């Protein structure tokens with residue numbers, strides 16, 4: 001038994017909860033997590049979480065993993081993939097049942113080469129997980145981040161730009177660049193710090209983005225916000241099937257806690 | 272170029288536009304059809320439309336097909352499947368390009384055996400269409416019914432019950448019946464006159480419903496609203512990925528034209 005949804009009473013009247021191509025925009029009050037959890041557990045869903053911790057960024061892993069254990073996909077199977085140049089620096093964090101961590105040793109370019117890196121690993125991710133979630137490491141989970149986000153392809157609204165008009169969006173504006181988006185085009189401005197989807201869709205996106213960055217390199221141009229520019233051009237042409245609200249990528253220090261955010265789920269750590 | 276969606280201005284504030292399991296509820300103002308049409312045309316989508324016209328109900332086919340040609344999936348590939356006991360009575364209606372009609376000659380039970388009938392035809396539908404849409408024939412299209420409805424599995428809100436509480440829903444209430452739903456369970460009350468989805472999901476539903484009706488027959492009980500009872504129990508246990516609003520199944524004679532319905536798309540013909 002759960003509350004009956006009533007078609008003439010919306011739960012959120014303050015925010016857009018569906019995109020114009022009928023992809024849910026994920027806000028607190030839009031979902032009944034008990035239903036979603038059942039649906040995903042019936043498929044024995046496994047969620048992969050990829051995070052890069054190169055050089056000094058290994059310092060962010062303890063809090064990132066500790067808070068993931070508290071809030072990320074709790075109850076579901078989780079496989080953390082930690083890409084690092086320092087395998088011995090990965091903290092040994094105690095994990096809940098059904099949860100595992102692998103350390104993958106790896107060699108503008110650090111942020112940029114993630115797309116490349118997410119796409120060798122190609123067959124390993126396909127056999128091991130159902131979905132892949134790709135996040136920044138300099139973050140902490142503060143509240144529930146669960147199977148509501150899962151879908152073939154998702155992006156996340158950039159917290160600086162969700163109330164803005166498209167002309168303000170910092171898309172790549174040089175036609176020279178594979179990331180180019182004209183001033184009168186564009187749905188949203190997505191942040192590169194949180195995207196994902198099915199393994200197939202994430203491999204497609206990361207391959208596409210990597211292919212497009214190489215083309216730009218071979219043309220002597222670097223998109224303005226780098227991987228995030230290409231991510232935005234990809235998601236314009238291949239629209240995500242869910243969009244996460246800024247509950248899922250916030251910075252309380254810079255932006256506070258507005259009323260429209262009922263929960264602050266995944267937030268920046270000061271650096 | 273199209274209007275930018277703005278996350279802090281919802282287009283519909285009056286109605287629920289997403290279910291609690293994050294399936295869009297399809298209302299005018301929720302979708303940009305230009306985006307959707309492009310997405311579906313890139314896949315060369317073919318939509319099958321099944322309709323039964325047995326005995327006197329052949330009289331409803333001319334208006335049904337004529338108005339489908341005006342409003343149903345215009346621009347997309349369409350294959351009408353007309354199940355009838357009178358093949359010579361099917362009117363010869365002129366069709367738009369990319370649209371074809373097949374006549375399938377067939378033998379409470381007429382409405383009920385549709386599930387059976389939709390599921391022989393099994394391999395024929397799989398090769399011929401991407402989606403199947405299953406409707407009543409005693410209807411007319413009055414406005415756009417297009418690719419916004421398409422998804423793996425959909426049902427449609429019954430126009431008598433979209434403002435009601437679940438205790439009022441005329442679900443099967445006898446535990447004896449495969450269609451049984453307890454008084455404190457249930458999301459919506461779906462009408463049997465308009466459902467569909469991918470061919471795989473529709474074959475699964477129709478097979479399930481047929482299997483459940485047989486079990487009831489072998490137990491001496493007939494669910495209260497017959498196929499619609501079983502459809503409602505199926506959709507409770509296997510939640511649809513889109514829900515159509517009552518714009519998609521209405522009766523102006525009985526129910527008028529309320530403000531909450533911006534368009535009346537598919538309506539009952541007086542009989």
Ligand SMILES: O=c1ccn([C@@H]2O[C@H](COP(=O)(O)OP(=O)(O)O)[C@@H](O)[C@H]2O)c(=O)[nH]1
Nearest residue numbers: 051052053054055056057110111136137138
């Ligand atoms: O020296 C570095 C710089 C970046 N990163 C990774 O690349 C991500 C994006 O960079 P950063 O968080 O610095 O970008 P910002 O959020 O400030 O724009 C980081 O979270 C890390 O996962 C890293 O591991 N080592």
Ligand SMILES: O=c1ccn([C@@H]2O[C@H](COP(=O)(O)OP(=O)(O)O)[C@@H](O)[C@H]2O)c(=O)[nH]1
Nearest residue numbers: 322323324325326327328381382407408409
């Ligand atoms: O003699 C009949 C009775 C029913 N039907 C089909 O079964 C559907 C459902 O029946 P009906 O429309 O009578 O049900 P209602 O909408 O009144 O409940 C009809 O649209 C027809 O497609 C038919 O073809 N011949």
Ligand SMILES: OC[C@H]1O[C@@H](O)[C@H](O)[C@@H](O)[C@H]1O
Nearest residue numbers: 158160170171191192225228
């Ligand atoms: O491109 C706009 C920029 O927004 C900043 O607020 C953010 O720190 C950058 O990483 C980039 O996303």
Ligand SMILES: OC[C@H]1O[C@@H](O)[C@H](O)[C@@H](O)[C@H]1O
Nearest residue numbers: 429431441442462463496499
């Ligand atoms: O079960 C409730 C009933 O609602 C009636 O209004 C409709 O005519 C019936 O076909 C059935 O759907």
Ligand SMILES: [Mn+2]
Nearest residue numbers: 136137138193
């Ligand atoms: Mn960061």
Ligand SMILES: [Mn+2]
Nearest residue numbers: 407408409464
């Ligand atoms: Mn009817």
